[PDB]
Design a protein around this ligand. Structure first.
Ligand code: ADP
Ligand code: ADP
Ligand code: ADP
Ligand code: K
Ligand code: K
Ligand code: K
Ligand code: MG
Ligand code: MG
Ligand code: MG
Lengths: 525, 525, 525
């Protein structure tokens, strides 16, 4: 189709007007007291909301260029949120500020590549300083406060997350499902999680999750290197006869076996998800034995001398749910008899007092954690199905945020540590003075988040910024209570990973667009 | 339909504006550091890319004339890439420069035929000087670096190509297929390749390949000159009963046999692809015997005294794939028993120590290479299907580039040998001073590739050109590291054939446009 | 439908603008070095061509009057080409020149009929002088050069035509069909050709040919005056039972016979094509006997005493193809046994040494030529089906041109003999001075073809014309090599009939439309 082609600033101002309008609409919702926005409905009384994601979903511009600039900004904010979990409106504010400044600098006739270099290395140095500032978010209080701020001040969600992880542990998995009545319920069910996932994304029947999700499956358990589908065909027929999804745990699947597995799956014959055998060596065989006991399955290992041709439904493990991540797989409610699982746990424990090696110490700790802690299952109790989905979404958002905080730490929330680092990295410079200017652009733009928080709360952005500058460390300004103090004390915990990802993706999009010189779109007809 | 007819400069400016806009959009991606271009998408997030091919795929103009001029330019760049393998954006820059200069010179009231003569003979002289500069690209390092630059800096692809060709050899074939897991695997399978292809393009069921591709076929092997389909009909029925594709390897197929073969193929009765018997004389019979052993087939030769009427499925050779090029056919995974193929290889080897003639020396070297080296089969391991296709297409592009470099050599990359030759052929002149002007046009425009590379990298085109002019030979400027040195050293290898084809097709299109005086299009309604 | 009606110059200027635009687009392709024209296509890559036929296929005008004027011009150029075989662009140049001159003369208030008279008698005198200049094109060299220039410099086509006619002869037919592989093959097959064709065009199932073409037909062979369908009804049923086309060769078919034959054919019962019996008298019966032997048929004559009711499929002749021209019929690959045909040939030869009369001498020469020379069948081998059709069209055009040159001779090509006659018939005058002006118009426009040839080659039209005028006879200017010399020697042969027909049809159209005073078209809505 005939195309409208733009070059340089022609496209750039076109992008930037849409970006700025998008963020002008979004940033009013930043902070605990974001400004009201009435998303118009097709019918009836429209919906009033106060979060950046809600409005960002409801935006389209007649100007195709402004619209697509908004589309890239929304895309990059989504990229951040995937690696952040919150700060979505904060990510939008950062994106607008850095994008607008970078486009204005590009229009100033100065080097775009140097802008990108300065911005990127400044972001790397800021990530390093945040990691230095990153204190480990491990305590149940900090986890509760992370689930609080992530779910827009919901303490109970983070508190229950901390309880579930304490009950089950990291070697297990916490899963969220539909609640029965109106109250959530947590169950430490018989499951496990090992750090081996699907060998091919072709097996993913739930592409949104990035993990194969099978309900009440048959679980083949192989401690062996597999090369041919001829050995596997009777098992495929057996599983297809009962109409259950199929999960393979093998030491290796190679060549024709995997090829015909892919062929049979794309034909829809069998729902097959094949993963690596956890660990290596004898530990792998023992862990397969734990799986076999928990799911009522059996280990198919050549050391037994038994072949895969004669593998049947009882031989294959049975669970109620399995989730096969990229390099991780978890079993939820293994159908295998629970007292048998207890006997296997006692077997692993007697193996524990037989071993003494610290490597073996931690490996057996992991095994007993997987088998006994099982899987945390959360059933969200809510009244209306719309509130059911709302609450569940809050729950997984807080869960992802708590994982990010555990793995990256939490800095003081409210945007005050940003002011701290601005007081710190005010001296950062690049190889070219253009890189210096990009660094200073970043320093300016990165105080904007707190500024917009205070603005939407109805108070003074820059005055709060200056007063925080007067302080140091966690000294800052609760924009909800609007009080100066230690943000950690009043529970405003923004994880290191959240702001880190938001800033990194904002830098990525700003640099990429700074280096953009032409574009092609469709004609406005 | 009523037509918009243009004459002379009326059509010419129409063409040239589209050409110039096309290249203005394309050339920003030239070099290792091409400029960002956001191709728009029909929905959601558009596509950010940095290569001229992708953007060339996404361009259409409302102006019919500018659009259609850009269509010829895209076509001619494709013609170059077919005979080049890369330099696509380089070919686009060359095409714009030469075409624009030639159109301006035509508009200058000056002889177009002389322009074409000057441009063409200058391009021929430049091809001669490039061949003089063409150093043989035969070593694994140079092949790896060709696969690197062709795939936009991908060393591993060229390195694996060098390994595969060392394992299999020239007399075999390297084939790329879908991988099973996430890592590629290379197999030296039992196949072969001889330099005889289809006698009629009608047999090509894969017109894009220019080669008949048959999967698990029946392979008739005839050492005889066929003339009638009456002898062939029982074989056709036998092959059609089993539903396999059919590949004839005959000394000759003539008259009624070929006619009714074409008729039956048009009716879709049998998938028949007939090829010449490799070589001539007794060597041909020996090679048919090698094929018969490798594919489990039999040689149908009149010297045995047996007739073709009694040819059946077991008699016909069996492979897993066959690819019949224009004058070349390769067999991939011959179903014939492998130890039998080994016995045949030992037979050819004992024939080797029976012979002593150098002609026979090399013929038997070729035979043993074909039979033992077989076919290299590469299964590209990738996660997502989109990245699967991306990686595979990179692989075949680098493969075509490596073949071109082997058959033509590599000159120093980055556009520095172009500056060398400009310093060299600055004295080239034509019979008419118009031909001289065309030659000087070529000399000017041919430094533009490096200029645009340095421009897109963000640095000075003409200053780099001058500094290279100060140097000689492989002295030049890495536009990625942006350093002056020997462009051969850091792997910047542009094959002789790539730039040769790009320049030749640019000259062809420029001369054709220079000689064009009128054109007819549809009315713009 | 409501009509736009134009009178006199109102229509005439409308006509002339379309004619002039058509020729302005076409004439750039005249000569061996015609200018490039890029026919813009609906999709993909447009088509670059250099011949007037291709561009003439690609023209339509929004102006209804100009469009339909160009439609008459294209029609008359087709009329010329049918009676010429080439000079299509030459005919277009002549048509534009004469029409434009005729219209500027009519607009001068001067007699149109006198213009017509002058033009027509000038064309007749020029035809007479061309025939005087016409040297017989009979040798294989001249035939090869005719097939060369006709196919735009293709020597091999004319050379193979000369070989085929030497092998088969005038009394046979040279047929061109699809080749099997990639090379053509010539076969002197058992056929014949006699100078009697269909008695009714109703029999023509191939109206484009003007000849009934029957594939593998049943050939009734009669030596009798037929009057009734009753005798043929059993034969019609016999032929319809086997589903073959039917060819009658009878001394005469009259009245109800032919009428109900037409009825049965229009009902589609039988594919009947009835022709005259060749010659008259006993020679006719003997020639029917030759047919009966060659096609395996039988002669149905009353001298035998046998009746037509009992005529069956074996009695009817069998061939593989028959082509029934207006007054000529040829048989290609008579199914009749070949050694039987040889016995019949020996029979005719012994008849030869029994006869002595020169009339009988040449009649028997013709008979033996028909029976032994048979039919030349050319199977054009080519790679692509598009190139197959291209080559077939080239071959048939060269064949028609060679026939025209054999029957009319060749004058020196390149347009130099036109300049010769302009030196010669400069003195031609008409009865009225208006007729004189028309004659001078013809003289002026007659040098225009060479002028346009030299123009498209990029050189001086009028200077070449003057230098040729300085010479005489075959002295002229090769516009490809651009050299002064003998056109006959350097292979540039333009047949007398080609230019004769082009000029005659140009004169016809010019005179007709000059005498046009009004016309009617549809309204432009
Ligand atoms: N008491 C508080 N004082 C100051 N800032 C807060 C407080 N509670 C939450 N915030 C910050 O305000 C933001 C709420 O904005 P919100 O509309 O949720 O956008 P996002 O979804 O991007 O976080 C959070 O990112 C959080 O860091
Ligand atoms: N390190 C380098 N220094 C200078 N030039 C390079 C370097 N690496 C690659 N190139 C050149 O840059 C070009 C990459 O441009 P690209 O967008 O791939 O266009 P194309 O597809 O036409 O090659 C290659 O043709 C290559 O010759
Ligand atoms: N070597 C030559 N020198 C001069 N004239 C030539 C030569 N070869 C061919 N011609 C003439 O040029 C014409 C080619 O024009 P072409 O595009 O084929 O138009 P047309 O199809 O009407 O002939 C021929 O008619 C032929 O008479
Ligand atoms: K909020
Ligand atoms: K590139
Ligand atoms: K021509
Ligand atoms: Mg929030
Ligand atoms: Mg490239
Ligand atoms: Mg011609």
């Amino acid at each position: 189709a005939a195309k409208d082609v733009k070059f340089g600033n022609d496209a750039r101002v076109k992008m930037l007007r849409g970006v700025n309008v998008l963020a002008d609409a979004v940033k009013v919702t930043l902070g605990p007291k974001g400004r009201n926005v009435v998303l118009d409905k097709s019918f009836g009384a429209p919906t009033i909301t106060k979060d950046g994601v809600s409005v960002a979903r409801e935006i389209e511009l007649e100007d195709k260029f402004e619209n697509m600039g908004a589309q890239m900004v929304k895309e990059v904010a989504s990229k951040a949120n995937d690696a952040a979990g919150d700060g979505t409106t904060t990510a939008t504010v950062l994106a607008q500020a850095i994008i607008t400044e970078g486009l204005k600098a590009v229009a100033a006739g100065m080097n775009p590549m140097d802008l990108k270099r300065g911005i990127d290395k400044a972001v790397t140095a800021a990530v390093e300083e945040l990691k230095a500032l990153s204190v480990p978010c491990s305590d149940s209080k900090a986890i509760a406060q992370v689930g609080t701020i992530s779910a827009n001040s919901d303490e109970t969600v983070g508190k229950l997350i901390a309880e579930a992880m304490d009950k089950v542990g990291k070697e297990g998995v916490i899963t969220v499902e539909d609640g029965t009545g109106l109250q959530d319920e947590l169950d430490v069910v018989e499951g496990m999680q090992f750090d081996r996932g699907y060998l091919s994304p072709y097996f993913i029947n739930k592409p949104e999750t990035g993990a194969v999700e099978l309900e009440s499956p048959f679980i083949l358990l192989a401690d062996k290197k597999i090369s041919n589908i001829r050995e596997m065909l009777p098992v495929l027929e057996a599983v297809a006869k009962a109409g259950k999804p199929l999960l393979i745990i093998a030491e290796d699947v190679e060549g024709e076996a995997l090829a015909t597995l892919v062929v049979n799956t794309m034909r829809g014959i069998v729902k097959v998800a094949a993963v690596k055998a956890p660990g290596f060596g004898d530990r792998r065989k023992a862990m397969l034995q734990d799986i076999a006991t928990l799911t009522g399955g059996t280990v198919i290992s050549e050391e037994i001398g038994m072949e895969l041709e004669k593998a049947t439904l009882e031989d294959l493990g049975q669970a109620k749910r399995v989730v096969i991540n990229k390099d991780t797989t978890t079993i939820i409610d293994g159908v295998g008899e629970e007292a048998a699982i207890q006997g296997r746990v006692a077997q692993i424990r007697q193996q524990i007092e037989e071993a003494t090696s610290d490597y073996d110490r931690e490996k057996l700790q992991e095994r007993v954690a997987k088998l006994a802690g099982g899987v945390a299952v959360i059933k969200v109790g809510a009244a209306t199905e719309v509130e059911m989905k709302e609450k569940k979404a809050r729950v997984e958002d807080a869960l992802h945020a708590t994982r990010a905080a555990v793995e990256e730490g939490v800095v003081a929330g409210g945007g005050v540590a940003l002011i701290r680092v601005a007081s710190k990295l005010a001296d950062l410079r690049g190889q070219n003075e253009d890189q210096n200017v990009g660094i200073k652009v970043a320093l300016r733009a990165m105080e904007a988040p707190l500024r917009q928080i205070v603005l939407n709360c109805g108070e003074e952005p820059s005055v709060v910024a200056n007063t925080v500058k007067g302080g140091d460390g966690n000294y800052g300004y609760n924009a909800a209570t609007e009080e100066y103090g230690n943000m950690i004390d009043m529970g405003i915990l923004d994880p290191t990973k959240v702001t880190r990802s938001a800033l990194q993706y904002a830098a990525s999009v700003a640099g990429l667009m700074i280096t953009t010189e032409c574009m092609v779109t469709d004609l406005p007809k």
